[model samples]
Target chain A: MKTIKGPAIFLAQFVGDKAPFDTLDNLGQWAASLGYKGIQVPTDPKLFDLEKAAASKAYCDDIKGRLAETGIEITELSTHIQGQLVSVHPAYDEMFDGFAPAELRGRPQARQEWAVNQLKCAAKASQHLGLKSHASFSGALAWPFIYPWPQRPAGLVEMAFAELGKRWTPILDTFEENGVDLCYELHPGEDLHDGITFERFLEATGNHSRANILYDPSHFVLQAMDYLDFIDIYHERIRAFHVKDAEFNPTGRSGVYGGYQGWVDRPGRFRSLGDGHVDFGAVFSKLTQYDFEGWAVLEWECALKHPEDGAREGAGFIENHIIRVTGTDDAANRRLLGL
Target chain B: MKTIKGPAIFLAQFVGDKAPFDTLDNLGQWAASLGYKGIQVPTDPKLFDLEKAAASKAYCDDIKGRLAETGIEITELSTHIQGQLVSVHPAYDEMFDGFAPAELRGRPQARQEWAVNQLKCAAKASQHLGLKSHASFSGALAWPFIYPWPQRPAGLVEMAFAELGKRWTPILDTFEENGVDLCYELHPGEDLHDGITFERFLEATGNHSRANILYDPSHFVLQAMDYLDFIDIYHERIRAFHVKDAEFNPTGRSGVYGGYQGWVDRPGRFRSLGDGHVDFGAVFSKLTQYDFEGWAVLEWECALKHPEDGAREGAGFIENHIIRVTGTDDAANRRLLGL
Candidate 1:
């Protein structure tokens, strides 16, 4: 029953983190200024502190204060990192350098324990904000298993799926307790990276409706998947949508894997909305077909321009091209509604 | 003394007038949020109420209060209506219905008198705002004398130029009295609408620096004028700059006079920057060459897109192309200034 009120943006899609900016109020202000009706708040460890979420009442209320002052609603909450707990690689020890305890870097068990606690806190935060939609990642038990031939594993991939289901059940329980639907973003590093793998996640997790999709077409486009096709195939499973795009190489020179280059150096690059070949018109048309009323959160990421430019331009792109303009005609709809 | 802080936009370029929304605060907030350092505020009669200019304190202070609250500086004030008054054509009486007295509809003399008073009030308003730069129009006396139709008077064009000088001198005097420099935008429908006529205006008014040009290349492009050449020709007279663009439809149906069509219906339409072929890159390069330091205010008008899109995109265009950056290392400058 969660529906987008109007245009919304993933707040972190542009400025990334507000820690380096003037004020935290600015984080919401930027989204509001760009004509977004609401924002999908990123629960980045850099911004949203878990200790601040002290048993829900003390924690989430303070964060809600700034959001309340800003006057923009929280359409959804993004907690991709906390959800990464469903599967973790010990090699990413330095990743949690600042937030996690230094001694627990190699201690995968303690990190997992800490991640679960934080996620439970996230459920409280999401509940406090009165949001039912949660966009997140389903972590891979063994993501390094992406590569094969050099050393093929017998039961590696199978066990990984089993681990994904086992670890995520408690995290899913937290969301279900709060009556929030957690969506797994189909990203490369995640356990459910694309359409096929997403099926594995559903099967492993017993086809829970709570384990739905935070659908961003960028990841699927990078893999040369039929991004539009995924919509119709998993239309019912789609809990939310992202307004993001990727530019693929028109020529044979560029590889899908990006030639192992940094973002800008790659031929297959991410672009702000309409700057790419992603036919959002066709995508949205499909969304309407499925009655998908979720927020088209602008997950803006373009390395070529400043983050502000990308975010602003992405908002402009949506205003001009996307954003469904059907049935909302007030005068006509008013009469239709017998008003 | 009048160096531009950085990329700025005419807030009125987007939203037209502050209606169907909240206070004028949102206008400044939009530009400020979109990375604009300052804004060129339009003193439109509909928006910036002239009744507020009681000794310039009662009204503008309320405006200044909102501006201060929003945290964006008023860079240049555009009082084009007052500028439009100097040559009050009886033909445009219907247009001045709002501010002009209804009985003075067809009376050019009475309307002219009212216009002059408003402009003097505008000068006071500009002084109150502490702005050195004023971008405005020179209401043309014989603007219809642009093209020769049936049979022209022998010295008709020359006399019209002489008339432009006679009328605008007093308005220029008011700006001078307030120590503000008002630059006439070289646009069609205005007296000093082109480089050649501008030259005539400067000569007629004794080369007054206050009667200088607000260089907007978009106007020149529509007429196929050498936009770049105008910079070198009137480099010193270039008191302010407008980041606007137009696409030229070289050989065909759309007349230079716009064929009595709405902007979009006509060919060679004014566009949000980068949508047209104005070559802002070269324009800014020339600004650098002439050491022309001024606000590149986006007089954003796009028939195809919303004003918000145009203004935001135009700001982005200038940042990426026109705003010259040389030895402007912020960290180094911050150190130099001992920040």
Candidate 2:
């Protein structure tokens, strides 16, 4: 009967060099004005200091207190960029190098180390902020070989997962130590994309308890999967929820492969909360059925729609979708069933 | 171990007012020249005469004998347009009115009667041609409300299925009488689009054994369903196969809904053989694994690629993909198992 907390905005897409988009305070004010109750902070220098928060509880408390001024609490800390740096494929090495520190650039080993430490810091920072879950990506190692063209070697995917397990197991251990759940967003490019792959990664990591999911129906919609069925299967592992929307319309020209087109030209596109094909009614119902008590954070990535408009509408969209569980009508059920 | 028959072409798209496209003999010669071993004949007046074939066994024999000269066999008789007329929603009535004859035009009752008779004719024609299966569509009634906006009333989908069952059951019975299977191409616009919807239609008709599938991986790829998984689930019901390629590439601007864009601009696209995202290797392997003894017919509908080129390349494409089953390697298995 637990109701999910919601109306949180992921600050990643909103960050910019302008007022209300530049600084953490201004962004918080903007989001809070849009009826957002919480903010899922990205570990950006402009918005948040991951190291400082991890090392000092006072800094975490101070930040939380400042955000509390706008009546918006800290939902969870996100390490998407840092986590992406952890196990990058060599094909994507140069492209993803900028996710790490400038000093760590060009050195894969140092970049990985920095990324791993960043995750550890996030776990500590989340604990310091009294957060229960964190969002991240299980950085891709075998995504380049996803299509299995030219025939992937026998042990390629296994080796990638094994290495992913090896890298992520220690990070999971740190999160376990800090009493925070590491919710990896099961995204397309990530090694833990779908249920089967996630299960593979879980087995690779010895099914670590902290190896959980960040439920986002948008990705499932894009993949053309039964997103509601996914919630039924992995709700227990879903510690975080992104109330995002997406649609996958494979036209005659493009499809899931996107024809190497940009976001605007691709068949699958992320949309503002209520704009896409994702049925949030079923999503909310399924999560509620599974007793999901996570924040319904907005991860707006519309190509055509304005970010401010998306953010503004998204808060209300999530708020409306959040089910207030009225427990089963026992009397009516008994009467109807003659029990 | 039975090897699936293949390198067949669906003659629907090649029909135009041009050389090698206007007449059945010309199209047959062109297809045979390209190494196609079979042709799935569409019930078009230019290429095929449904009524004549149904009424006269000589007509059927003559058509088959002529095609046999080109070293091409008749894979299946298609009633897609006729089937579409069987249970059209009023919303699509005017648009689909042209599918029926001029006498039946603008008359829903007459149109349906003509469609039913056309299907019956197809069954007899297929039986005469020695085709074990026939291909058609399960015309949509609920597709217009697929999104469920404004909230579809209860029993609306069930009613649609019930009516579909009422309409199709008699046609299926006619096929049963003729000893031919009616394989519905589970396309998006059709009511029996996906596995679940097909199941729904099946149950609506009391699980009629003749209610079978014309497995087309292109539609599945467009819908983003695991086509390989689909074969595992419904291979027994798959009486026909369309070796078509498709890709779904969702972009930032449009997705599964297509944003009302035409085929050229849409993200999901039908492609030439081996050019799209559909893994025909896995498709052939899965079908072979399931003992699908059907023709691997090519249904080329690429937006960018020319039809002639697609047809030319498609024969070899299907030929290469068809798996020749080698029964288990018992000697190696025994040695591995320490026997």
Candidate 3:
């Protein structure tokens, strides 16, 4: 009975490094002006500091008013940093060194505790905000071995997922108590990277309703996977979604594994919503076919374009052609569809 | 257990009309560059539209990240327009006609319903932001009846208060359910114009915890109502606050009643934080004395100065001399206080 509501953008990607304080005051106006109806805001520090619960809650207080004023629905709230801790790795520490307390730095157990506390705090914050779902990266202990080094170490992958279960158990409980769901973005550098990994994650988490996948076709497209088939296979487990696109530009010097050159200079690159390899049009069709109830959030990450421009293009592309806004009366349609 | 946090600004005063899209990105950078720790963002349409819950929540999802990124706390969110609906008058139509659906125009009942929905939606949005309190202006049903001029009608004031009770009963319940407090600003033209009126409002709402005051000494100073003494009497009821000041200039042609002229041409006027009658030094001292845990918000309303200048001066005034930053060790004090 559910329908693709409308177009949305991931606030973190746009408000990332450029404008830190881009409050919903500015972001709302920007989204509203562009006909964007919803957005998924990242819970990253680049977005908001989830350190002290009290201060963080106070920060959350003002945000509520802005969203109501803007008329933009929330697809989901992404907690990328803390979700990274459900399974820890040293490389994650190197990448997100600034996330936890300095004293907790280089200390894995401390980092895990800090991240776990943050996750619980985030759940509280989400409850305060009335968010039913949250998105995050399940940090990978197996990412270094994603490509199978030395024919892969024994019990390495299994142990990595076991870490996710052990780490995320209490966190998921916290979310369930708060009436919120956790959607793991199926992308690289995490315990759950694709359909198979996501299935493993759900099994690890015991297939709890509070745990699921944050489906993104771009992630699969980069790996040259069947983005269309991913839609048909795991449509039900897609608790939430990310609206992004990518294309594998395998140059003569570079192969599928992104050339050692920087992302911009690499073979595979993320493009604007329409300028990519995947048929987002087909993707949207399948979403409608499956009755995707959640948001098709635009997680824009085009280094070649301005965040504003990417937001404009991405949201516009989805709103104009992709999203099918039929059945103004949901209940009536539900009866007809026997939902 | 509550303590004065730190310096903050009312983002509304700086973000008036066009260019409001100034992005907290810039504001966060500016506030951070200046060492200010928190802010109070207005829940007005100039900030975001509240007619739809979905859009508002989307807006909320993004704003949470903005505050966290800037490392600033949110003292409170302003729900001024919808708050006015609890006890409305025909005269208010001019100021807030656009808040509700156009079809609801000229129909007080419809307006009230629309406004109530907005209040509830606002509370849900507030819940999403993890805010404990929201600041607002309870609309005045007796505002037109404030002055007993052309022969005061019998039981007019009594009926006005009764209307507030019937109207706000459910709204207050909504806030309570969301775990957020509704702080009404004690200002002229509001149902609770001063301390006495606020007490009446508290009684009207059955002395609920959610219904309380957003103290602004400026409103009292203009009336020669002893702003300093007012704080001591209602310190416990202060759920949130406004860090603003007023100056009374009674010229030969102008008196205390604002001379019935424009603020610029009037004698009594609201001034920048420190450029007014009330002693902010004493105000902060009293706040400390009272153990007010909520924010000391900066509500700037200056006609003769640039917004940036006013924000800079307002935040600077509170940061340097007004805010009392006691209890450096939160964890230590928290444990000792047995809270």
Candidate 4:
């Protein structure tokens, strides 16, 4: 019967060289002004020093103190960029190299090691910041062949899942040790993109207790997957919520495959909170029914809408959608039936 | 794992005054010519006699004998039109009144009694034919309030559901007596439309053993629901599968509500098999994973494509999609890992 915490904004899309978007303090103030009660801080080094936070609880406390002025708290720490480097396929090594440090760019093994350590640091940082969960990607090895070509050989997918699990096991252990959940944001490029794949990854990792999901309906909408049903299946493991929106409109030219088109031109693309086909009513209802204990953080991204407008509208959207569970569960029915 | 049975066709749409569409014999030949191995006969007087089939096993055998000429058997007995009268809401009484008899017209009470008797007959008719399941609808009382314009009062929906259950309990007992599963087609017009509504109906019926689902992904597609994930949740209750395709393309002008548009112009509309957005690959995979034992019956419907062409293509589409479960299961993974 736990009511979800909410009206939080993710800082990834707002990072810029400008005054308010550049610093954590300015962003917190801007977010608070837009009626956001919490902020999901991205560990981008510029905004959050993951290394320093992991080493010193005092640094984490100081960062929290700065945000206290705006009456906002950290929802979760995001490591989307670093997590993508944890298990890079050879095909994506060059493309994903930029996600790691310049020194580790050409060195795949070193980049992977650094990525693993970054996750460990994120876990410790989350612990220091008094956060219960952290957001990240599962990295990917089988994304290139997501659409089968020469037809995958036997055990090809299983091997990739096994490798992904092997790489994330230690990181999962680190999160468990820190009393934090490692919530993977299952996006298109990640190995744990869908429920079936997530199950495979879980089995590969020996069903790690710390492994959890950051539920985002937007990604599922794009893929034409059932976001609400995902909650029904994996509610126990869902530790974070991204209240985003998206739509998929396949025409004669393009479809779910995207057809090499850009975001705006693609049939399936992200939209502002209320502008898409994702039914927030059902999404909110399902999450609340499951007693999901997570912040409804707005991951605002739209091809047409401006970031500031999306952010402002998104806070209200999340606030409107979050249900305060009527503790009177079935009382009216019982009364009506004269029970 | 048992491979799904299919290459079947539901004869509801194809029925007409034409020669091939006139009689069951002609329709069976047409269906078999198009590579169908089964036909789901609607309890249309023009095609089937529900009264005689329930009373006489010889009549059922005779009908089966005629179908044996075309090498196709009965998939299931459909009472969609009759089932709609089982518990009509007063709002829809006049409109759905036509679904009953000329005698029962303007007689809601008699119409309900006739509908109940029709369902009872269907269960017996199915048992006589050695059929495992029957297809029908859960007549709705809450559908008019689906959009919630005036705002539903407390226990309004609950009362409607309770009445629906009280009405269907006896009919369900008849089904259970005949050893037949009465699968309610959770269509848009019916009370058991989505998973949640079906749950409500289930609770109302005291979780009737004969209560089941006629899984049609087309209806779910038009509703913007997760059809594939539905198999994951309600597979055991799913006794029938309608291999119909559909698309939901919400434009600026219209969305899930349809906007009173024609099928051709509606944002969400039924499409011919292989002519729409349903991911049948995943659909087949999920159903097979759950060991679903039902015919892949094509309920050929489309706003654009010709019915004959749709039917011709659908048989091959279904045959192609039905996965032959490899008994090896995960033997390849075990072998690759030197187990």
Identify the candidate with maximal lDDT. 4
Top TM-score hit:
4
Please, what are the lDDT tens digits per residue for candidate 1 over residues B199-285? 887888877768877888888888878887677677887878888878977447766767788888777688877788887755665
**Can you tell me the DockQ of model 4?**
0.08
- Tens-digit per-residue lDDT, A149-211, candidate 4: 857667768777877887899888888889999888888887889998889999988999999
- The residue ranges of model 2 lying beyond 4 angstroms of the native Cα positions read A327-339, B1-339
Across all candidates, the chain A TM-score values are 0.85, 0.94, 0.85, 0.94
* Tens-place lDDT digits, model 3, residues B30-112: 66666678877666654454544324666766666776787876666776866776566777775776765578767777787
Q: After superposition, how far is residue A296 of candidate 1 from its true place, in Å?
A: 2.0
The full ranking of all candidates by DockQ, starting with the best, is 4, 2, 1, 3
Q: Native-vs-model 2 lDDT?
A: 0.79
Give, for candidate 3 chain B, the lowest lDDT window spanning 10 residues.
B318-327
Model 1: CA > 4 A from native: A1-4, A13-23, A44-46, A51-54, A58-62, A94-103, A250-253, A322-339, B1-339
Per-residue alpha-carbon lDDT of model 3 for A50-114, expressed as tens digits? Answer: 55432466666667666777787666667786777656666455446566667776677878877
Candidate 3 off by > 4 Å: A16-21, A44-62, A101-103, A323-339, B1-339
User: Worst ten-residue run, lDDT, model 2 chain B?
Assistant: B252-261
Clashing pairs in 4: none
Candidates ranked, most accurate by lDDT first: 4, 2, 3, 1
DockQ of 2: 0.02
